[PDB]
């Protein structure tokens, strides 16, 4: 049984980063060569393992997280990063073990009028913990004036839309991101290579 990476990587729709998607990979064999043999990825970084040594390993509790962000935010999807995405949307632990894969998705995620369907969290009282997911939509008190759960001056709805237009600069174009989480333990492993 081949692991269903195609349905993660080639899913027609991707989640907004604030509501990032996660799928468990279990009881299957994985050929990662199909990933690194292509030149479709603008980011392909592995932590705690080398990408060309992935097929030689067995893993426990494999996870594949996926979402869309802006091109110039992809560096935040790494251990030890900060910024709007790493702080408020999707946070990797300093001790992350896995791979971060990204590619430009302007052709699929941009639109002549502007695609505003992809959202990110703009405001938050504190930084996310690693792998924490926050889908709340309470009004954010950005200033001295109380909000009482009402939108108004200095009282903001916390999610904002990316504006993806096809003629944006590359750094402002949408990128699809897949984060593969691994654990390499002295324990049984249901995910192995060829």
């Amino acid at each position, epitope marked *: 049984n081949l692991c269903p990476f195609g349905e993660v990587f080639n899913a027609t729709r991707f989640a907004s980063v604030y509501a990032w998607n996660r799928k468990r990979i279990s009881n299957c064999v994985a050929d990662y060569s199909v990933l*690194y043999n292509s*030149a479709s990825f*603008s*980011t392909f970084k592995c932590y705690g393992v080398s990408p060309t040594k992935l097929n030689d390993l067995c893993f426990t509790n494999v996870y594949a997280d996926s979402f869309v962000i802006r*091109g110039d935010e*992809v560096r935040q999807i790494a251990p030890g990063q900060t910024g709007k995405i790493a702080d408020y949307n999707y946070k990797l632990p300093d001790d992350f073990t896995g791979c971060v894969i990204a590619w430009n998705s302007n052709n699929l995620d941009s639109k002549v009028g502007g695609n505003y369907n992809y959202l990110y969290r703009l405001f938050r009282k504190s930084n996310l913990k690693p792998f924490e997911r926050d889908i709340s939509t309470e009004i954010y008190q950005a200033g001295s004036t109380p909000c009482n759960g009402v939108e108004g001056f200095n009282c903001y709805f916390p999610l904002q839309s990316y504006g993806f237009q096809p003629t944006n600069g590359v750094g402002y174009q949408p990128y699809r991101v897949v984060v593969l989480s691994f654990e390499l333990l002295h324990a049984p492993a249901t995910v192995c290579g060829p």
Partner: antibody
Amino acid sequence: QVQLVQSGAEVKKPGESLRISCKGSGYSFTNYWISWVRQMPGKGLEWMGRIDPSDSYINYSPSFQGHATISADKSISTAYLQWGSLKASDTAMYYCARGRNYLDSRGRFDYWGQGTLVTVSS
Amino acid sequence: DIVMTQSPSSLSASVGDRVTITCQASQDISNYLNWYQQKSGKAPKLLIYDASNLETGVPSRFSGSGSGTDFTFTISSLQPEDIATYYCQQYDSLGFTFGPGTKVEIRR
């Protein structure tokens, strides 16, 4: 103008350590991969590896096991190639090259350093 | 583990001749191939990227074509300053592999 400037020619005895450098100017150093390329006496070009200066992420060629190590110093727009203990077979010309922008998946070397000639000899 | 080959290993042509050299990859690499020129005593110079795109400022007598496992690089009208070794270069999401080079000399 994008420029890559390498350190001067070097002669070392076998077993000595050596670090050669490559300083980028005229562009955002932390946004492009820097590669190192070896040219043996009379031979062709061999890609050794590449480093992302923003996080010092390194991809090494499968050939180069762990002899030469690539590094970068963000603060001074400089990338490095270094040997803990040189061997005769390290006698070569070494080029650094700017590769792809981190946003770009199309690899190509659009700018090159002038090359550093290394001689390992007693 | 991608092996790149080039043919011929060397050639001689007259000024104004059309020169075509080839590059082969051991597996399908789509159009993920570049071409470089290296003059004696110089760093290599990118001429063609992604199999067929002319680098900015590169004379238009140079061109490249092909995809998959076979590629071609063509000088439509060989000029005296064109004496050099020409390299193809495969790439993927991790790194690069250079071809072995084709040395071009001029007949006069």
